[PDB]
Amino acid sequence: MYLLIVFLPLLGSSVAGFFGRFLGSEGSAIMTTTCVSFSSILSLIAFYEVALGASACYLRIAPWISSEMFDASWGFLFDSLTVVMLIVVTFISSLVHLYSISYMSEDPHSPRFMCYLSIFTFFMLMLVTGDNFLQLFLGWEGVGLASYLLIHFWFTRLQADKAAIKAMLVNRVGDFGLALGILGCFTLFQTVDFSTIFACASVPRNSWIFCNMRLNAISLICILLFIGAVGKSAQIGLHTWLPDAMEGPTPVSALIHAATMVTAGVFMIARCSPLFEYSPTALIVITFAGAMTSFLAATTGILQNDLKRVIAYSTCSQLGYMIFACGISNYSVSVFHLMNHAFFKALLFLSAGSVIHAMSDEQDMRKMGGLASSFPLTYAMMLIGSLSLIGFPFLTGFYSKDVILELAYTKYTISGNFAFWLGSVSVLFTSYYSFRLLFLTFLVPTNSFGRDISRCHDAPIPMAIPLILLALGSLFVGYLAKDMMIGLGTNFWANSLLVLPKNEILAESEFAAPTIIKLIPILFSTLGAFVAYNVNLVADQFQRAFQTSTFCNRLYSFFNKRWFFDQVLNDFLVRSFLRFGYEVSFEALDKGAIEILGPYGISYTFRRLAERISQ
Amino acid sequence: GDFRAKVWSMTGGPNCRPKHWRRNTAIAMFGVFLVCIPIAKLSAKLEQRPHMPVRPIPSQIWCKNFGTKDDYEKEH
Amino acid sequence: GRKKGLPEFEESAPDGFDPENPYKDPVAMVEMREHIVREKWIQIEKAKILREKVKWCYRVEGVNHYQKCRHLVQQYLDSTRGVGWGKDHRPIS
Amino acid sequence: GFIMEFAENLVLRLMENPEERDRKAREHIYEMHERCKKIKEMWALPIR
Amino acid sequence: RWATPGHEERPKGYFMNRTPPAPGQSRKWEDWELPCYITSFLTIVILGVGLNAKPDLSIETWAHQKALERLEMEK
Amino acid sequence: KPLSVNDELMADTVGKYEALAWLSGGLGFFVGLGLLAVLNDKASKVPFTPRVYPYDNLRVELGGEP
Amino acid sequence: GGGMETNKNKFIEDWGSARENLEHNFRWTRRNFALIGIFGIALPIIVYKGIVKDFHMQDEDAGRPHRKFL
Amino acid sequence: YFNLSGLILCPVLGSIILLFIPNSRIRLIRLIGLCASLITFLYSLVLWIQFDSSTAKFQFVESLRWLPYENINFYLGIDGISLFFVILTTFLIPICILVGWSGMRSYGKEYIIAFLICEFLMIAVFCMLDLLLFYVFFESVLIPMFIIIGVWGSRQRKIKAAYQFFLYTLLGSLFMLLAILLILFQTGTTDLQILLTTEFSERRQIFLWIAFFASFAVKVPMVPVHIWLPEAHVEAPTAGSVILAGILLKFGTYGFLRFSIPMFPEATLCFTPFIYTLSAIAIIYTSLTTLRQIDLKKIIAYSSVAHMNLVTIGMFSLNIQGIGGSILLMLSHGLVSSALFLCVGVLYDRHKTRLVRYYGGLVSTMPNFSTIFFFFTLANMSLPGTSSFIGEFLILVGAFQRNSLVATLAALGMILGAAYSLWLYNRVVSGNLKPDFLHKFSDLNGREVFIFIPFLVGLVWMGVYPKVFLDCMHTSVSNLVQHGKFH
Ligand SMILES: CCCCCCCCCCCCCCCCCC(=O)O[C@@H](COC(=O)CCCCCCCCCCCCCCC)COP(=O)(O)OCC[N+](C)(C)C
Ligand SMILES: CCCCCCCCCCCCCCCCCCCC(=O)O[C@H](COC(=O)CCCCCCCCCCCCCC)COP(=O)(O)OCCN
């Protein structure tokens, strides 16, 4: 019954892609939707059975790689952590499949889109249900391949291809980091299986020689794994791919980049917690990177005008929050916020796509307004999603973000203070741009054109059922799962997550701090909402400062253009490497220098030597 | 266009809609169901549950490896 | 026509081979090489069996695996030091 | 009666005999080393 | 949309870009198809029936049953 | 119109060096905030003593010597 | 136009021929000398020193004397 | 009883039968050549079945006297290392025959005869256990390949490329032959099993190792001598490139595995940093030069140098993960790379061009080709579930255990390998069409669909269950790891 969970999306993809000519645009949708939905219900029984029944299942099919001791078999591991990711990934995938039935109603190549979605779901399931470090790597790179394929689903566009290739390059650096980490894991424990590594993760206390440096064996492995996590989760080091990856279809944004494949890094950190717990040096790096990513995305997302791009920076900020929540060695809260966000961010993307599709694919907030009366349902749904995202009290986003912030406060260390400060300011910024997105799209006086308003149609049934289900989730699931995941002394996780007794600060997070700290996110959210209203709905529009102050214009350009990452990084790395490819390696090393000392550059003097033999 | 109707693709092409996609759809389900039976039978055989469930779970109807690995000292 | 069943190898050091001057009797040299390979593979498989024991101790015990699998973990890590053609830690066979 | 039985009894018949292979290898090494020694001594012969 | 019969009676484009043969006739095979197909059939037969029926002679099996024997004799 | 030799690889308001300076300032903001966090010294202001566990800080249950 | 062969362009064909006939395009200037003497004479030396020193530090950690890699 | 004699005699009979057949009977020539190639392939597959995987002794040994005093003689034998090479070199020939099926009327009988003589010469190379005769069949391949490059070349450049390749091969060959002669004079014989039990004085190991490296490094182009490979490869027929990249690039690594890594265990250790240095920069330089190439066949030809230099890192690691994982990469490379040249050959046969600029938007006109081309693009970029990843990862874990720095540098190879591999696919397949340049299209025919099928099956079968190949080699590669070691 558990192999069916993983292989139903694979069979659906293999049918809809190999025999889509016989099923058409409707049969290919039915196959994939039915297969993923059956996998989702099977994941529901898996949750009732493993997570709630407290009986994990371990399933090994056949050995994959069998060297002397490099054994990485075809093993599947379903524990409490895996099942949560299953019920998130597969449920969101089924809802996205149902959404795309009506979204891809006029696009010609709908069957290939659904085949790609099913193969992506299959790769994500192989990622989450991975017993080894290699099956995990198999899914970790198949998910990148599927995202690349889906980003340029419209191959005729040029921006889509550029975004897809940039995403592949960034994910390739991440994969290099992950591969180095996996190589480090095998050199220590002589195994790649999770059970043996997590069982023997405490004994080794030796030092290695890595790249002319003497480092700690466990710390180096943890840092190398975190490099891969940064690559996939779009953290401070490698994140420029995610905002550019919005050139794909909206359902691609809602599943490929909102709920899944950005939480892959967080899931890998949480799963490898019995190993990250013994390298305190790596936790500092994780905390710093998460705080930096959250603040940077929050600052970048406040001046964007594209509807889809604003939400991408919200996703980046939420992933940063999860990352430095893992950095405080509290993985239960990280997974809780992951599951919470996978609801009210998928809802946000789906509602934004519903607005865009009805607006003749208009993506600029400067050219929409007064849509609240025209789009009642979608306005309500985006209101629910935004209120959950900002962390409105007694809502799905309130039971996780507030806990993360108060936990960061009570981590009385140098790294914890930095994360607390950045996560506190990011709440204000998140409230500001979330409410700006809500205000400009729906409540400001109309700025659109006559043709867009004339051709308006709200979401039909296939695009409304997933929305309503996600709204119910974003209303109640956080409260329902608050007790089992971030409760005191809960045994829901069982052995999935390990938190050492020394670094356990969950109890003090609740009653050790002033009540003001527990109300800082709400006050900052209210301040951000007030600022957004006062700058958008009613204002003299002092933008003349942006037309008279040179610094203000450059400051506006700094936040708008992703902190000048794409421009600077391109010129100083990509262009430099492109020159390094031709102007030296091809132009001088192997062009004529070998030739001139080779067989014909100067060795053709035999013509000037053999002809002289007549003497 | 005019030439894309002369190109054979496995996926079906742009705006593909065969006259008998209803019958083909029904066959595809039955084929998927037939290939899913051995996978389910295989899964119920190679799966291991070291821990007895708190409450009677549906997997006890077919799976039989419940509380078998408790003697891990004699594992191969 | 080989007999049905597993291969049979004589488990004894080939007489006539002396480590003082290995390049003295060539047949004893190749026999000794094959023999040494065989015991290194035996050690590898013993380490693999101990790894399986640790693997199923971690899963059956659960949270209590730190005190119940300590005896197995130290045996497995002691048996993985002299595996064979691995890290610079090479067994003196 | 089944394909597997005949197939395995055929593969077991096709496979080579191990003891004679090792014996042939050992005798080959002996004879080759002896012939090598005689050939080197042959080369040691002077022209005159 | 979900009830109307489709318009494409047969999939667009011929398979392998070969026109269907004359009515009441058959696709005449090329000079290479039959030897290649009998080769591909014999390859599958030999590999499936030969690799699965050859004895499990390996150094990861003899060594496994020798280590499993010496691991208990130590007690 | 002969093609260029490097005809295989082909934020306009800023230059590469000026934008690099802006990026350096933006990252120096993070560095300065980290230095401020170091200067705060939150470790010495913890309001509770380190948690003490029974049975010698759970030595046996954490893999210690029995 | 009953031919599958490409309608090759003079500009593209000449550009490709020039990009493939670069063997005879050195002038032996200081740029080429410096380039081949740095990124073809020094980087290999740096890398070789890196591996040799990595082996040396691996050797000293185990207490075994350095291996003569020459 | 299937032995090495029949497997080698089958191409002989195939080439002799076509030698005395009138050229007007074009059909009969093709049928007999294809039948001979298929019979040889089935013979190799049968030889796989009866291969013992528990003994390091050479199997199916055959002897034929060469000198009157049996000093040197034709000793044929296979082990776990060279068995799969024989299988691959017998499997690639029928594909090469099928490539030139349509246009065979112009080539004539001299095409199949040349390819069958090639197969005869390459089968004996992987089966010889005599150092001298391994050199004789090592350099007998030049004549058929010289003829293939020259007679059936594309443009007038075929004279230059053939000369350059021939000159490089000769300069390597004779400098190796001097070392072989010095070994013969000192030891007395040239039998491999005798040369592996003879102690070499430490001073003679360096000189002989360098002399052997001179000939082998040319056929596994390290850094100074990968300038003949691109020109000779581009100026070659579609089937000619498959032989050059599929097999002819596997002589250097096989020569290292058979005659260098064992006969000089002490010399190999001393030169290990030297090989790591050359291979690390070759991976970095070649995978970077590939980005700035404009010829379709000159990009994939640069994808082999990076892959083949990743193999020499694995062999010199001297462990089961390294040496054992390097063999899978060459089998994977022999299938992935040779399949990519079939994809380029498909494009070149229809549209007589190779510049990437002329190609674009083929996803809308050649969808079956795009699906097949994409799959081998994934294999070339080391995707899990493909045969390349298993070899690529096993080499990395085999070199990290010996030197963490060289495994780090070699890990950037897959960073750059995934860069041009997908970027080429985006240019050629994805994008908009260019009706100004080319407007008539035809997707894969019956031959092309069928030809790619064994590559598709043999690439995932090795990629998801490589245990079938691995378990046949561990007994043979473990005896290779330690030869001078006795502890
Ligand atoms: C190898 C391990 C990883 C496997 C990943 C598989 C991911 C899919 C890989 C192939 C995807 C296809 C990309 C190359 C072709 C580009 C699109 C294309 O042309 O394909 C055709 C053919 O359709 C396909 O894409 C079939 C390939 C994908 C379906 C088969 C996948 C089966 C499941 C994946 C493999 C199963 C195991 C995976 C796990 C190891 C579709 O054409 P249309 O959508 O109709 O539009 C083109 C316009 N015109 C019609 C005019 C030509
Ligand atoms: C129409 C196609 C359209 C595209 C299709 C795309 C690809 C789809 C098919 C994927 C490939 C399927 C291959 C099977 C892979 C998984 C099974 C691995 C094989 C396996 O486990 O069985 C082993 C071999 O038996 C066997 O079953 C061997 C039979 C395999 C035949 C494969 C023939 C490939 C021909 C390649 C020729 C060149 C070869 C390379 C040189 C024996 O297992 P064991 O060792 O444990 O024994 C235990 C005895 N107690």
From Swiss-Prot, chain C:
Membrane topology field: Peripheral membrane protein
Cellular component annotations (GO), alphabetically ordered: cytosol; mitochondrial inner membrane; mitochondrial membrane; mitochondrion; respiratory chain complex I
InterPro entries, A to Z: NADH_UbQ_OxRdtase_su10 (IPR019377), NDUFB10 (IPR039993)
Cell compartment(s), UniProt: Mitochondrion inner membrane
Keywords, comma-separated and alphabetical: Electron transport, Membrane, Mitochondrion, Mitochondrion inner membrane, Respiratory chain, Transport
Function, as annotated: Accessory subunit of the mitochondrial membrane respiratory chain NADH dehydrogenase (Complex I), that is believed not to be involved in catalysis. Complex I functions in the transfer of electrons from NADH to the respiratory chain. The immediate electron acceptor for the enzyme is believed to be ubiquinone.
Protein name as annotated: NADH dehydrogenase [ubiquinone] 1 beta subcomplex subunit 10-B
Swiss-Prot record, chain F:
Coiled coil: none
One Gene Ontology cellular component annotation held by this UniProt entry: mitochondrial inner membrane
Key words of the record: Electron transport, Membrane, Mitochondrion, Mitochondrion inner membrane, Respiratory chain, Transit peptide, Transmembrane, Transmembrane helix, Transport
Subcellular location: Mitochondrion inner membrane
Domain of life: Eukaryota
Keyword Electron transport: yes
Physiological role: Accessory subunit of the mitochondrial membrane respiratory chain NADH dehydrogenase (Complex I), that is believed not to be involved in catalysis. Complex I functions in the transfer of electrons from NADH to the respiratory chain. The immediate electron acceptor for the enzyme is believed to be ubiquinone.
Family label: Belongs to the complex I NDUFB8 subunit family.
Subunit-level organization: Complex I is composed of at least 49 different subunits.
Protein name from the UniProt record: NADH dehydrogenase [ubiquinone] 1 beta subcomplex subunit 8, mitochondrial
Lineage summary: Eukaryota, Viridiplantae, Streptophyta, Embryophyta, Tracheophyta
